[PDB]
């Protein structure tokens, strides 16, 4: 028996890209592991259709989503952008095939699509986990530095802190033109802002650290908190002995033996090298959709046509399994809110930079709050 | 001769909707007025295709845009919500037909689409006017109250003020599960927050005023600023004798006699007012019509979204539209040539006195405030 | 006509070494430039013998010096390390051929050799400039960090300050078994030692800066002084925006246009810089050439170290060299007539600003500091 | 059987010197005793070649070292200066005949000669023995007065005291021009510096005492520590009753009967009168090299030529015996560090001036520290 899934990935070169990125590789990686796994889909071969497209091309994303639907798939692991994903989301809702999302995207409440889940930990919860950390460090003031216009929406639960708890916090945006953040850092330095929360990509975080050291802000006077769940992927050796306090989060359950086995195996496969959060969530996504097909009553992949009208009769029940799903993945205990389909409940590691290196100094969940 | 514009509008019932909404009306209304203007497209006839769809339905929007492109249009006037226009923009760009946009949309920098303009005043500029106004009242501390998450992304040049200036700024959000903003208001009142900025629709604004009064907050101790451009359209009679300071903006150039004439024609087809959406759509349709007249000869073509052919004269037309300069209902209209966004524009500043709401100044990105 | 200078240089592989080092290059480079200067030894041709030897090998040095004297030279340019030149100096003095020295050497008072000069600025004078600078920053307490034992003998006029002035001075040494100065740095940081003087090579200095930053000590709370004359040659871009105060000295007269011209020719044969060793060797070779031209007629002779004959014109030449006065790459050059040492010279004082490293003064044994 | 050793000694008059100095006499003295000793080299006559040269003449030192090497010797007891000795050291390393050193000399680490030992107690250890004394006297401050530029290098372990233990110490240099140290003593007196450590020759120490008494600093308010191991050779009778505290060291094991027998016999030989440290170390050196030749397997003295290339085949093994050597000499328990060849482990007497005269009030070694 053969079952098929669809993946759409964004590449700087679109369809012409010749070298495979980590998302797509993680995809192919997890499909292969499930096919060598004797306990999961033992008699079914999990195959895929992979489509490569330019960044920020909704139209192209629509064209490929329809192609895959015509080819027949049980789910579409939609594109990684926020604009491209809100087009495939609508299509998956019309044709009733599950859409799987890996990165935070804005879900307007007044938007009534239900045919999706989202594996990235919800930013409302993340904002709370940051607040519990900050209240625990006793900070009475702090600055929030975010990258793109979207940070304010992601951090709204955090920005509305002054009106609840007693912490005055300033708010600054990294330059849109340049990725030279020195002029900003000069302003924070002059402003004696010593406790800072940086919301931004692991890439941009590496830059900010390098440049904070150039500005003489990598000392015992400073405490940085990073929102990136890929903190453990930064080379922090050049900053290890400076004496800065540096704290962030980790959702990847490294303390678990079979997870470490998978991350090691993953890096052995890489040719460009750790497993970042993007790949780990996709590996978990492909597993949840597989595990769910197995517990779902027998269904078939149907060729659906976007211009046509027919929907997928099995979709509704399948989507329900996925939502109700609860599975232990690389990124720990996985579960979605049943109505929103968002991953608003999860477990975080609180990690902190020591001389000896990054160290797990606690944990957090929405129910138990902080625990150091 | 005949030119055809495509229009896509969003409804709660989708296509099934029975009644036109204000926007679709302002669309039909403005196409009709140019066909009667003998000084504008005199011997050419503007026509339109009109599609109705459900809110937040990009898939539907996609299909209707493609239907229209296959029909032959020189421009498409996209939906309102910010989710659908991402899809239609992308299409208009692949086939190179101008996409006219009327409401604020997030335009990521990474995004390389060029076949659009957007007639809504850029919120980065509105944010700057709001700062100029706050600092002009000499406010040292305020409270920013907003509605949908997207309000943040908009007022950002304002939220980042407590480090570009001496001002302390609390932040709150209207209830998402209700229209009952009373509980919030109790907390602002306890908080002794007297100077407040409300980002929200004119509808919400009317609800907020009525509830603010009920809460004992409509007095001379309070000063509210509204960012809604539709402020002048609210019934403020229940409030003008309370002592409250109430201030905001207006982009509809009502001072102009010819605008006032038009605002009257329209409101006689709708107290004798024309909202921003309607007036911006009216200005969009004119701008496109006038840029067609002005440009060289060109032909409309049927285009397939599955085929791979772009509109020949597309690029030529799109530049006429980006470079356009036009005195519309909403004042002088001009676009940033690079971004296609309306970052330069004029605002009238209005305020609530006993004699009623009145213009107590002006603003522009160049001159800032003038009173 | 032909004059011949002898050069002895030290290498890790000794004679076997394949690649020239900077010094031997600056030697060949400077002999070549005078042979092209028609205003200097116009109709006479400067040539050289060059010997390579192992570091710290006086026996080898002895043999090569003797080889060269038997070949016929008007001067010998001794090795770098301080162990070997004691031997070659003694030889040059017995046979009375000038020994040119380029690096600091201990010159015991009991020692009665007179056939040498030494172009390195005397460290007793450098020590005085370092005091003038410290007392000018109004430092009340510092920490002197040095590399090799010999650093002490050099900074002595500075170490003896806490009884010739009100200043309290801790003393530390870089690890001898490692280049990892981090552990030391931890102890200075705990010690709250913020004002620090580093005596060490430019290489070591670069290591120290990089490790100081890693240790969280490159900030506005710290002020480092470097005694290395090669400071202006370090890449300080990673550090100029941190706020650190960084100060030191420069004897290369880079302000002078003609020096800058030359520094450029050389670095195009090596970011476009010329270290002190290279520039001092260049000045030595000129000084000797110019003192030959200026002196009376004289002949080179083959001399045996086992025989007992001294160079006839030796003493006459040696006095021309000791009494020499010359504007070289390293500024005005002049020697103490008695000691043959360079105790009088000019220093530019440089400091690290955002705009980069720059000259914020000058110094000389006569006028002391001037800012 | 005849075996031969080489000695080079520095004389103010060089080769023309007619009156023999104490070093050279000690040399000739020990050779004679070994030749009358029935238990040490019973069947071998120890002969020598002695060369006299000017002070600070490396070239001359090289010429004589080569002459002796051509003549064939089993060791060369190199010249007493620091500049002259670092030339013979190199030669002995090339030709592989042991070089024997009697006085502290700078051994740059980056210098890779191995064909030498040095009998003077290492100054790093001496600095430690001084520190243990000072910490034991409870001094919280003190001045260090040294003579020639070299003192700082010899005393580095002591000068870096402030950053380890808690003792603030000033640092002053005796005048290079003059041996009139009164102007300096005036400055220390005015500066109320009462606890002083003088690093300098026994000759210069005698001068400083005489002049400290003239300056009225020879009282119960003052405590002087002298580094010179020749302290016992100073006439301290004029200062004995002043009440000053005056402490120094002694490596010459006087408490040993056969040592006193040798020192008495030595003074009986002198015509210019105690045995100073210079002569005693040379007597010990000549003995260690003899004792080592006897335990070494049979070897021969070879005529080596400096211009030639050949080295001495027996040298390496001989040098090894010498380094590994451990012998009780006039200067107590003798042993070298096997890699450095320096005498960094030894035993000191702590002596102090009383009314009744100089008295042994304790002992010190690097392992046991101080013991009073
Ligand atoms: C097989 O799949 C099961 C169920 O998810 C998982 O627990 C197990 O680790 C997998 N085995 C291997 C070795 O892949
Ligand atoms: C850094 O952490 C330490 C100890 O964990 C804390 O005492 C200190 O306040 C922190 N630094 C800042 C600037 O908060
Ligand atoms: C799940 O999300 C929904 C939709 O926002 C929310 O109303 C509900 O409170 C959540 N369920 C629970 C019990 O957390
Ligand atoms: C209302 O406006 C008046 C002046 O126009 C000002 O004096 C007063 O302070 C304002 N009210 C508040 C609470 O700011
Ligand atoms: C148009 O807008 C962009 C983006 O905000 C801005 O950077 C640029 O200055 C504007 N272009 C011109 C030439 O005015
Ligand atoms: C750095 O230099 C400035 C003035 O140039 C001085 O005020 C400051 O104290 C210096 N830093 C230290 C730690 O001495
Ligand atoms: C040369 O140097 C010596 C030694 O430092 C010094 O004493 C003397 O004053 C100098 N000679 C002259 C005449 O300048
Ligand atoms: C003979 O030499 C031995 C061994 O060093 C020594 O112990 C003894 O004192 C010597 N005897 C005499 C009287 O010289
Ligand atoms: C001299 O020694 C005595 C007793 O041994 C001691 O009490 C006194 O403090 C010493 N003098 C000085 C100046 O240290
Ligand atoms: C002997 O000296 C060597 C060379 O400096 C040193 O490394 C070693 O620690 C010493 N040996 C011992 C065990 O004292
Ligand atoms: Cl199966
Ligand atoms: Cl109303
Ligand atoms: Cl460098
Ligand atoms: Cl025998």
PDB file of N, CA and C in Angstrom, chain B residues 29 252 254 257-274 329:
ATOM      1  N   UNK B  29     -20.894  53.725  -8.521  1.00  0.00           N
ATOM      2  CA  UNK B  29     -21.134  55.152  -8.494  1.00  0.00           C
ATOM      3  C   UNK B  29     -20.045  55.957  -9.201  1.00  0.00           C
ATOM      4  N   UNK B 252     -10.239  63.469   4.064  1.00  0.00           N
ATOM      5  CA  UNK B 252     -11.221  63.940   3.097  1.00  0.00           C
ATOM      6  C   UNK B 252     -11.176  65.462   3.074  1.00  0.00           C
ATOM      7  N   UNK B 254     -12.691  68.238   2.758  1.00  0.00           N
ATOM      8  CA  UNK B 254     -14.046  68.782   2.799  1.00  0.00           C
ATOM      9  C   UNK B 254     -14.094  70.302   2.610  1.00  0.00           C
ATOM     10  N   UNK B 257     -14.611  73.175  -2.175  1.00  0.00           N
ATOM     11  CA  UNK B 257     -16.002  73.262  -2.639  1.00  0.00           C
ATOM     12  C   UNK B 257     -16.404  72.126  -3.570  1.00  0.00           C
ATOM     13  N   UNK B 258     -15.533  71.757  -4.504  1.00  0.00           N
ATOM     14  CA  UNK B 258     -15.857  70.695  -5.445  1.00  0.00           C
ATOM     15  C   UNK B 258     -15.951  69.325  -4.770  1.00  0.00           C
ATOM     16  N   UNK B 259     -15.151  69.096  -3.729  1.00  0.00           N
ATOM     17  CA  UNK B 259     -15.270  67.857  -2.972  1.00  0.00           C
ATOM     18  C   UNK B 259     -16.612  67.850  -2.252  1.00  0.00           C
ATOM     19  N   UNK B 260     -16.937  68.951  -1.588  1.00  0.00           N
ATOM     20  CA  UNK B 260     -18.196  69.038  -0.861  1.00  0.00           C
ATOM     21  C   UNK B 260     -19.378  68.791  -1.789  1.00  0.00           C
ATOM     22  N   UNK B 261     -19.311  69.316  -3.003  1.00  0.00           N
ATOM     23  CA  UNK B 261     -20.351  69.045  -3.980  1.00  0.00           C
ATOM     24  C   UNK B 261     -20.521  67.537  -4.163  1.00  0.00           C
ATOM     25  N   UNK B 262     -19.407  66.826  -4.336  1.00  0.00           N
ATOM     26  CA  UNK B 262     -19.435  65.395  -4.632  1.00  0.00           C
ATOM     27  C   UNK B 262     -19.895  64.585  -3.425  1.00  0.00           C
ATOM     28  N   UNK B 263     -19.385  64.931  -2.244  1.00  0.00           N
ATOM     29  CA  UNK B 263     -19.742  64.231  -1.013  1.00  0.00           C
ATOM     30  C   UNK B 263     -21.246  64.268  -0.824  1.00  0.00           C
ATOM     31  N   UNK B 264     -21.851  65.347  -1.309  1.00  0.00           N
ATOM     32  CA  UNK B 264     -23.289  65.539  -1.244  1.00  0.00           C
ATOM     33  C   UNK B 264     -24.029  64.648  -2.252  1.00  0.00           C
ATOM     34  N   UNK B 265     -23.545  64.587  -3.491  1.00  0.00           N
ATOM     35  CA  UNK B 265     -24.160  63.727  -4.500  1.00  0.00           C
ATOM     36  C   UNK B 265     -24.194  62.296  -3.990  1.00  0.00           C
ATOM     37  N   UNK B 266     -23.084  61.855  -3.413  1.00  0.00           N
ATOM     38  CA  UNK B 266     -22.962  60.485  -2.951  1.00  0.00           C
ATOM     39  C   UNK B 266     -23.860  60.188  -1.756  1.00  0.00           C
ATOM     40  N   UNK B 267     -23.908  61.097  -0.786  1.00  0.00           N
ATOM     41  CA  UNK B 267     -24.674  60.837   0.434  1.00  0.00           C
ATOM     42  C   UNK B 267     -26.180  60.937   0.169  1.00  0.00           C
ATOM     43  N   UNK B 268     -26.540  61.514  -0.974  1.00  0.00           N
ATOM     44  CA  UNK B 268     -27.926  61.526  -1.424  1.00  0.00           C
ATOM     45  C   UNK B 268     -28.259  60.209  -2.147  1.00  0.00           C
ATOM     46  N   UNK B 269     -27.267  59.331  -2.257  1.00  0.00           N
ATOM     47  CA  UNK B 269     -27.445  58.007  -2.853  1.00  0.00           C
ATOM     48  C   UNK B 269     -27.084  56.907  -1.864  1.00  0.00           C
ATOM     49  N   UNK B 270     -26.465  57.285  -0.751  1.00  0.00           N
ATOM     50  CA  UNK B 270     -26.252  56.367   0.350  1.00  0.00           C
ATOM     51  C   UNK B 270     -27.513  55.543   0.575  1.00  0.00           C
ATOM     52  N   UNK B 271     -25.102  61.770   8.643  1.00  0.00           N
ATOM     53  CA  UNK B 271     -25.927  62.828   8.047  1.00  0.00           C
ATOM     54  C   UNK B 271     -25.208  63.532   6.895  1.00  0.00           C
ATOM     55  N   UNK B 272     -25.461  63.076   5.671  1.00  0.00           N
ATOM     56  CA  UNK B 272     -24.819  63.630   4.491  1.00  0.00           C
ATOM     57  C   UNK B 272     -23.305  63.563   4.568  1.00  0.00           C
ATOM     58  N   UNK B 273     -22.777  62.352   4.703  1.00  0.00           N
ATOM     59  CA  UNK B 273     -21.344  62.149   4.887  1.00  0.00           C
ATOM     60  C   UNK B 273     -20.828  61.074   3.920  1.00  0.00           C
ATOM     61  N   UNK B 274     -19.531  61.090   3.607  1.00  0.00           N
ATOM     62  CA  UNK B 274     -18.941  60.005   2.820  1.00  0.00           C
ATOM     63  C   UNK B 274     -17.720  59.411   3.491  1.00  0.00           C
ATOM     64  N   UNK B 329     -10.772  63.374  -4.012  1.00  0.00           N
ATOM     65  CA  UNK B 329     -11.590  63.686  -2.844  1.00  0.00           C
ATOM     66  C   UNK B 329     -10.742  63.688  -1.577  1.00  0.00           C
TER      67      UNK B 329
END
